Structure 1
Amino acid sequence: MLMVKVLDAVRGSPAINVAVHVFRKAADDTWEPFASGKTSESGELHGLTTEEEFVEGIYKVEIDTKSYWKALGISPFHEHAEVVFTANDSGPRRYTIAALLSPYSYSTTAVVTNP
């Protein structure tokens, strides 16, 4: 129900091998590790969670943009990109978090559909 897609705006391609970490805000206001992975050759990361596990709450997706650019020999501006949102407050949805990367800029968009 949670998918991440990363695109490279310099090369016009999927962003491959980008580390992604997902956290859920605990009752004590701490970030608990929730899931992680790396984008595939299509720049996508699936299978982060299940419907039973993906309960109502505030989630943070942290995308390691810095390592990505370093490996291309580019010194980027941001340390990482993070996306923080309340999920599921009126029932289960499918969430797609898209990011579009340039060295000194990024865009992030959410597409939310009802399964």
Structure 2
Amino acid sequence: CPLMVKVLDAVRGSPAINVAVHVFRKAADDTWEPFASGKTSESGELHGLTTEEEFVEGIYKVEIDTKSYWKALGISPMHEHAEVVFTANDSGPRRYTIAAMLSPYSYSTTAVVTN
């Protein structure tokens, strides 16, 4: 995959499963244009978002939907999304994995960029 997203639930110690992930690319008018979307697997992973061709240099926002994810724990999070922004491909084509460890009022995200 040119772009993979992996989401972990840092409260329960488990993959974040079936969580909506929307990816955007900064457009000509400075707004965020919808780029790719999916839901995380049983493993907290979202593969197949994009193709090498579609995935040109630019600024991308990964939006993880955290709104009702910790409803059952009875806490409303700091925000309805966990967002990670990265600047891409900005020296030829590379594979990205965006790994996010999520808690309601914290998060740790790491971009692993390969090739």
Task: Give the TM-score of the pair, scaled to structure 1.
Answer: 0.91
Higher helix share: 1
Q: What is the percent sequence identity of the aligned residues?
A: 98
Q: CA deviation at 1:71?
A: 5.0
Task: Give the RMSD, CA atoms, in angstroms.
Answer: 1.3
Can you list the C-alpha shifts for 1:36-62, whole angstroms capped at 9, x where unaligned? 111000000000000011011111111
* Residue in 1 that maps onto 2:40: 39
Alpha-carbon distance in 2 for matches of 1:48, 1:77: 27
Where do 5+ consecutive residues of structure 1 fail to align?
Answer: none
User: Aligned pairs, how many?
Assistant: 113
Alpha-carbon distance in 1 for matches of 2:103, 2:90: 32
Can you list the C-alpha shifts for 1:63-105, whole angstroms capped at 9, x where unaligned? 1112211255432222211111110010111100011111221
Assess, with a 3 A threshold, how the Cα gap between structure 1 residues 53 and 42 changes in structure 2: closer, same or farther: same
Q: CA deviation at 1:29?
A: 1.1
Assess, with a 3 A threshold, how the Cα gap between structure 1 residues 36 and 72 changes in structure 2: closer, same or farther: farther
- Deviating more after overlay: 75-84 vs 56-65: 75-84
Q: CA deviation at 1:24?
A: 0.7
